[PDB]
Amino acid sequence: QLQESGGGLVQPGGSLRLSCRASETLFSLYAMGWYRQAPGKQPELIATISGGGEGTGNYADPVKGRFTISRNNADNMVFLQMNNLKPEDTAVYYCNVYGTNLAPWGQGTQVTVS
Amino acid sequence: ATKAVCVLKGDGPVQGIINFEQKESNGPVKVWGSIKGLTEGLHGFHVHEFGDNTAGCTSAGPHFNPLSRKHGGPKDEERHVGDLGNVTADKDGVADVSIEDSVISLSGDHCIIGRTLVVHEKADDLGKGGNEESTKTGNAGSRLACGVIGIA
Amino acid sequence: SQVQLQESGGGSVQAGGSLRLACVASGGDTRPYITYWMGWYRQAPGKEREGVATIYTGGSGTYYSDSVEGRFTISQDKAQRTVYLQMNDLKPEDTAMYYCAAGNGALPPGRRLSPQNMDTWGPGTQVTVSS
């Protein structure tokens, strides 16, 4: 029901592009977010996308100005374009709705910066 | 049994009617109706402080916050009083609102009669977004339709 | 300033053929939360405008008239501000002028495919089906 992909291992300063395919039923809330389960932490919301049309993005302070969220309405997909990766961003990035009751988490994708 | 009603209008096409009811004093409030004209998806739903619509939905001021708290989803305990979270609009852009909340009242210190109901552009992040703005407005975006809550 | 609709793509075709009408919207308020009920309307000479299908600009809801149900499919490219009509398995009775029209996003059920509740119209494109 929520399928991530696109992480991997990257040198500091590098860039990645995470991709998530969501159920039609989840996606049509048009409120989706990329959470990062920070090392030993509970999944924090890092970027949201909601609104009309192609949508509008909102970034948590640690990533603002380095991550770009986006969606593909026809394909039920959500993308997180991460640039200039710092060590701190190492974590597993899950994708899921926000602002309502969460869906059973997907596998998420591993992002390692060293 | 106190009743109340609100008619939401705006500049955009968004518009609906939301009714309130409160059987017992200081009890819980049934909130129900239908907004039409929305973008399919989630929309922030808030009772803002003032019943002023002179400069439109801007005059409503901030979310109703008599206890001076930070923003939150209606199920959280740190919340504004008028923080009711999100409503869902379907593939036809109609949201059939059906809430029951126990913090807002039709009477007493928590009374919203004379205040403004507001449906917002995007989705309220319930305060879980991680930037200063998420703890005030919840990043619900701009105001689409509003109305003063009156007596029924 | 005002929204303006322009149809395209009608023509002549053989009974059983295909057509893909398209209407593109120009000018007007381009902001995403201004939803309309974009619709395709059909007027044969000496009859009344009919209305065959409509689509929500806010979401994806589509409603078709009973005379074109299985055959016509209305789609949209919200980012190109375009709404499409794939008419296939075309009968001779589908000959008419085809108009695209827009109307308030908040129209209730029952008033979304009525040309009276329709606000701005496109000029028309002619579709003739020969047998």
Scanning the structure block, which residue is given the tokens 């992909």? A5
First to last CA, chain B: 10
Catalytic annotation, residues of B: 46, 48, 63, 71, 80, 83, 120, 143
* Residues placed in the known binding site of B: 46, 48, 63, 71, 80, 83, 120
Q: Write out chain B residues lying below 8 Å of A30, CB-based.
A: 39-42, 123
- Please indicate if any CB of chain A lies within 8 Å of the CB of C105: no
Residue B20 carries which side chain, given as an amino acid letter? F
Supply A81's token pair: 């374009």
Contact predicate C124/C6, CB 8 Å: no
Supply A66's token pair: 């380095």
Residue of C nearest to A52 (CA): C32
Contact predicate A4/A18, CB 8 Å: yes
Contact predicate B107/B56, CB 8 Å: no
Which distant-in-sequence residues (6+ apart) come within 8 Å of C10 by Cβ?
C19, C21, C98, C125, C126, C127
Contact predicate B51/A40, CB 8 Å: no
Could C33 and B39 be called an inter-chain contact, meaning their C-beta atoms sit closer than 8 Å?
Answer: yes
* Residues placed in the known binding site of B for Zn(2+): 63, 71, 80, 83
- Please indicate if any CB of chain A lies within 8 Å of the CB of B41: yes
Report the Cα B63 to chain-centroid distance in Å.
8
Supply C101's token pair: 């029209």
CA distance B84 to B47: 8
Q: Where are the domains of chain C?
A: 4-130
Interface residue of A46, A54, A58, A71 to substitute, partner B, most B CBs within 10 Å: A58
Maximum pairwise Cα distance, chain A = 38
Half-sphere CA count of A59, side-chain side, radius 13 A: 13
CA distance B68 to B60: 17
Residue ranges and CATH numbers for the domains of chain A are 2-95 (2.60.40.10)
Does residue B11 sit in helix, strand or coil? coil
* Shortest Cα–Cα distance, B75 to chain C (Å): 28
Chains that touch C (3 or more CB pairs under 8 A): A, B
CA distance C78 to A53: 7
- Please indicate if any CB of chain A lies within 8 Å of the CB of C33: yes
- Please indicate if any CB of chain A lies within 8 Å of the CB of B14: no
Which distant-in-sequence residues (6+ apart) come within 8 Å of A23 by Cβ?
A1, A2, A76, A103
Closest CA to A53 of B32, B4, B103, C57: C57
The torsion angles phi and psi of B13, rounded to 5 degrees, stand at: -75, 0
DSSP run (H or E) holding A41: none
Q: Write out chain B residues lying below 8 Å of C76, CB-based.
A: none
Resolution (angstroms) equals 3.3
Q: Write out chain A residues lying below 8 Å of B134, CB-based.
A: 58
Contact predicate A31/B123, CB 8 Å: yes
Could C106 and B36 be called an inter-chain contact, meaning their C-beta atoms sit closer than 8 Å?
Answer: yes
Q: Write out chain A residues lying below 8 Å of C58, CB-based.
A: 52
Closest CA to A99 of B121, B36, B14, B129: B129
Supply A47's token pair: 């970027």
CA distance A30 to A71: 9
Closest CA to C82 of C18, C26, C131: C26
Which experimental method was this entry solved with? X-ray
Could A51 and B86 be called an inter-chain contact, meaning their C-beta atoms sit closer than 8 Å?
Answer: no
* Shortest Cα–Cα distance, B117 to chain A (Å): 19
CA distance B82 to C108: 28
Supply B49's token pair: 């402080």
CA distance B147 to B15: 10
The torsion angles phi and psi of B49, rounded to 5 degrees, stand at: -65, -55
DSSP A61-94: TTTTTTEEEEEEGGGTEEEEEE-S--GGG-EEEE
Q: Write out chain C residues lying below 8 Å of B95, CB-based.
A: none
Does residue B57 sit in helix, strand or coil? helix
Could A45 and B128 be called an inter-chain contact, meaning their C-beta atoms sit closer than 8 Å?
Answer: yes
DSSP C68-127: STTTEEEEEEGGGTEEEEEEES--GGG-EEEEEEE-BTTPPTTSSS-GGG--EE---EEE
Give the class (CATH, top level) of C4-130.
mainly beta
Closest CA to B118 of B148, B80, B79: B148
B91-113: burial string, b at 16+ Cβ within 10 Å, e else: ebbbbebebebebbbbeeebbbb
Closest CA to A69 of A11, A15, A111, A18: A18
CA distance A28 to B41: 6
Is C88 exposed, middle or buried, given 0-12, 13-18 or 19+ CB atoms closer than 10 A?
middle
First to last CA, chain C: 43
Interface residue of B128, B139, B142 to substitute, partner A, most A CBs within 10 Å: B128
Which distant-in-sequence residues (6+ apart) come within 8 Å of B44 by Cβ?
B85, B86, B118, B119, B120, B121, B122, B123, B124, B137, B138, B140, B141
Give the class (CATH, top level) of B1-152.
mainly beta
CA distance B90 to A12: 43
